[PDB]
Amino acid sequence: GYYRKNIKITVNHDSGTNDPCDRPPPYGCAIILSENVFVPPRRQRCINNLEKLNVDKIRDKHAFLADVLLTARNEGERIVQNHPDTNSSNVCNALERSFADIADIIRGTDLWKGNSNLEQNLKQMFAKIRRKLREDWWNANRQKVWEVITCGARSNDLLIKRGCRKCGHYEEKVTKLDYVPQFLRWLTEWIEDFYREKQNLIDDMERHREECTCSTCKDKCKKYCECVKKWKSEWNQKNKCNCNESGIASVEQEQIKNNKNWIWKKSSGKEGGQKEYANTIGLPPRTQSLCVVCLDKGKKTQELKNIRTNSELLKEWIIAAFHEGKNLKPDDNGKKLCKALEYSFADYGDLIKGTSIWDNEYTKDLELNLQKIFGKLFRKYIEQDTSYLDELRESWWNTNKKYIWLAMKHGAGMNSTTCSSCDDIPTIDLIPQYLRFLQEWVEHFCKQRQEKVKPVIENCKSCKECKTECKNKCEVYKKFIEDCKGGDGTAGSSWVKRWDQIYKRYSKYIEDAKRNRKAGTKNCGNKCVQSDIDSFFKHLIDIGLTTPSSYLSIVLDDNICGADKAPWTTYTTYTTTEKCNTAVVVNVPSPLGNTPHGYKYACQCKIPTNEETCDDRKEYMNQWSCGSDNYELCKYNGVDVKLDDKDVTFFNLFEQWNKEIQYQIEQYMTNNCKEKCKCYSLWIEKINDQWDKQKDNYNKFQRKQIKVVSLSNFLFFSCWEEYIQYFNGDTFEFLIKKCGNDETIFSEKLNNAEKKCKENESTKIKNAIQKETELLYEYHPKGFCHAVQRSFIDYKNMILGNAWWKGIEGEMWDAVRCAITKINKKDEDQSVSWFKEWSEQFCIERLQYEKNIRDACTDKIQGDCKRKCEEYKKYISEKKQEWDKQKTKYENKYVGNKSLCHEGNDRTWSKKYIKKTLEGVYVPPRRQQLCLYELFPIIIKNNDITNAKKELLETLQIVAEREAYYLWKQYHAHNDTTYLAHKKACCAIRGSFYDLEDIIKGNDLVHDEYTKYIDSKLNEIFDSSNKNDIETKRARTDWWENEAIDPKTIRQLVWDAMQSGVRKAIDEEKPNENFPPCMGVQHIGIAKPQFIRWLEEWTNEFCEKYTKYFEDMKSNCNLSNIECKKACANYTNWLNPKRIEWNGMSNYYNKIYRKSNKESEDGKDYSMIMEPTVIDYLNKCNGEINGNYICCSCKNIGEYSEHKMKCTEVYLEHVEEQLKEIDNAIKDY
């Protein structure tokens, strides 16, 4: 609900900026040593937020619902964190009592609270919506209110629901039915409070009377007796070792019977389970058969509920563990029994300390009895060393985990010296139960997979007809892997779906642990990460194990899942043939693959073809299907076909093919060698066949149309258009050099590709040259190739006044080598080389002048420093004088807190600077025009580490401010000033801030000179006397999101700098604008990966451009050769680069999703994105722009068969007139 609020189904916060819950000591019968408002309980509230409900948003009941749910959520959190009962049933009862209290508040039937001016506030809303209606409203929203109130309840909370888990949060029926009048409810809560106070006083004097002596306790009991009598008098108003002595709190420190089957459903009536963990993790068969009912399989000897001392509790637990040991009695004791005992011991641990995620209709009773026992036993422990109930359970388990382990060992026959019993206690119990269940399930699946794959690997390894050697066994393996029935591992589903559910739950843990800014990891109490799920997953994120794939790769054994090395990291792709229906491509880890790893196109009894190897090498791809009097269409693999229609469709396909093939050839010109150019020559043959087919097709087009320009004319037009669309809107010679003048160009390009393969696969004056080399050596060496090439080319130019020149050049290497041996005894190359030598000389001279001016300079500095500054300025001016001429000559040869920075609306953007593998990454223009000018001075200073950090923080602040100001000014400089422009500028500012964060954290994909110098200097700055890449990349990270420096860390500090910049933008440029709600949220979530943000920005920009262009065409065209052609050319010109960019981005995204830091490329997280394809991810763009959670607002893409004929026919006319312009373009020169 868009309200001072953001977009709130699970937990609110968010309609709370108006009035807080404060007025107020939380209430958790006052003790006496030796008003008539007694009817209301101890808890008087939680109410102030709902109080004075007269905000302008009262015409909609949804605002009232949001406010009441916020109040209920805050009340529930207060009760959960407040009520000191150490009993989940009592906490649930208190939550239900508060729910009934707010029920009577909203219904307003029996409202008796000592607040003023509340009933009128409620009646205002209930008359705007317009007391029976109030009751109907409550009976309608009861379910939602009870869902929101118990959100903060602990996971191991029990509800009696007499009329269960987590205070009845998950019941699909409100649970307790409190329709009773609050008079009896308050009386019941009062008597409960008195009884609880009596037991509290008993617990107090248990450690007081026995130690201090007595009489004072009896006096207090007497006083409470008269207090109770005084209360009841007014009640005419009724008519209206081996124990917990040690106390060890272990801290984690980790570095890099009946029928039983795997149950995955929710907690059923009597078998398996929790509701939250349903259909996302499977109970192992052992975990359901833990022998507490194992007293004698029932109770005949002695009742469980007789634990007077914790010694009895330990005895009972020891007996249970010992009887568990005998259940696994049938070497196995090193790999099977040891692991089984480890998992059973961890299960006991995680069910004693209230971490179990499974239910067996005895776990409820066991948990309730354990809570009662711990409450009645340990009271003094529940000055923060002796005093801690969950921490009490964890400490008790850690103090007595050794005896349970020994008991189960002696019960399994595993007596001693096995898996003096030195360091025998497992560390497995520390990791969360979900990870243990995942590992057990995966190792079971591996056992089955190895059993089913051993015949395959032992049969057709020679091929790494065929009756049953390998055709049949691989069929059995495929049936095992691909079957909707699943198998023993699953519970009625395919392995892929179960793995997807596991991945979803693991990613939910990863995101939940990453969002919690609470200290988590790195809390010294060495590292000493505390015993919590969030801390453990923070540690896993710090390692990089952010996916089940990599985690299982690093925790599982080796050669456990098959004789073929099937890694859990290398994802493999396959097309399903079973129901798992439609042929959907699936990417899964190698053990879950369709066929054994490395046996693709080798199990079908076929030699691996070179074409297949190139097709599965993911390199040198030409995505063109080449399906075919009729036109031999070069149909694309992705989309299929949907003046006549045939020739125009062929023309569009031919134009797209021409553009994409030219781009691919140019890229491969820009871009072990044996198979490399085997695939390269295959690609060359494919594109040559495509070119021949397209030549034939264009001949057919010309002979059938009857005119259209010739083929060469169309290619010349294409060359001109691709030149114009960098030089939008010298050049003459460059165009002559690139393409011809008044079809051969592809012949030359393919010849160039072939010779590039050949080169790659293969790989007096005559004395004056050595004299000059010796002289230059004696001058000093660095960069001698430039000197020798310049001298030789100059001498050649003088002597000449074409293999002969090449022969002379190649013959004189021997002279240079002879000169080298003698001294041991004791882009073109005419102006570009001169430019590079001049640049190197300038760089060296300027670096020397840097220290020359830094000598006596480092407030304003005068004296000697001004002389050096004046000389440096004179040198800079003199060098720039020649730099202008050098740049002009280079371009003529070929073109291919204030601050001094520019503001430039550039709409085109392609890949030019990426670290690179990194294929299909295109940097958005907003990030390309990022202002890092002011960031260079502050780190040129190279002086003190603390001063360097302070100055870097200041410069980051000013850069963020200027970037935000320019972004807001640039977006609103147009005619539009509505809310849409505000949201667009908000999203752009957020993206820029994320890009700054990634540059600081060193995760940016850009690799140009700016970021190169920035991260090169920052690596030196953030070196803590060590050169570890991980250590420095985490030291530059914790300075950002963990350096508090009232505590306003660097992230919110830079965000406030952006806010100040946008306020400066607002406060300068209808009569009075206000601060947008998005900009003032002051809360920023975890940033999505750089590529994903870039992809969303591309989608938003492309959708906006399509909406603008298509609407323009719908008016100009569809009734004309000077106005409709403009829209036609505008729409066609920008589509092809978008086609190429989308193809590259999709190709990249196909190898990103479901990857971790280790198994992916460039070592980025990339784990949170899990959608199958790029379209399936961008589909989850729907909706308008709002704040941060949504940035893309694409809509109305499909619903164009119309405006095709007219757009193409004018395009041909546009080509003819441009080629007629040759009369004044190339004819005269």
Numbering used by the authors: 43 to 45, 47 to 50, 52 to 57, 59 to 68, 70 to 74, 81 to 86, 93 to 103, 105 to 173, ...
Task: Give the published text.
However, DBL5ε and DBL6ε formed a flexible wing region. Uniquely, our structural study showed that CSA binding induced significant conformational changes to secure ligand binding, which was not reported by these two works.
In this study, the VAR2CSA ectodomain from P. falciparum strain 3D7 (~306 kDa, containing six Duffy-binding-like (DBL) domains, N-terminal sequence (NTS), and multiple inter-domains (IDs))8 was recombinantly expressed and purified using the Sf9 insect cell secretory system. The cryo-EM structures of VAR2CSA ectodomain and its complex with CSA were determined at a resolution of 3.6 Å and 3.4 Å, respectively. In line with the previously proposed model, our structures showed that the core region is well-defined and covers NTS, DBL1X, DBL2X, ID2a, ID2b, DBL3X, ID3, and DBL4ε.
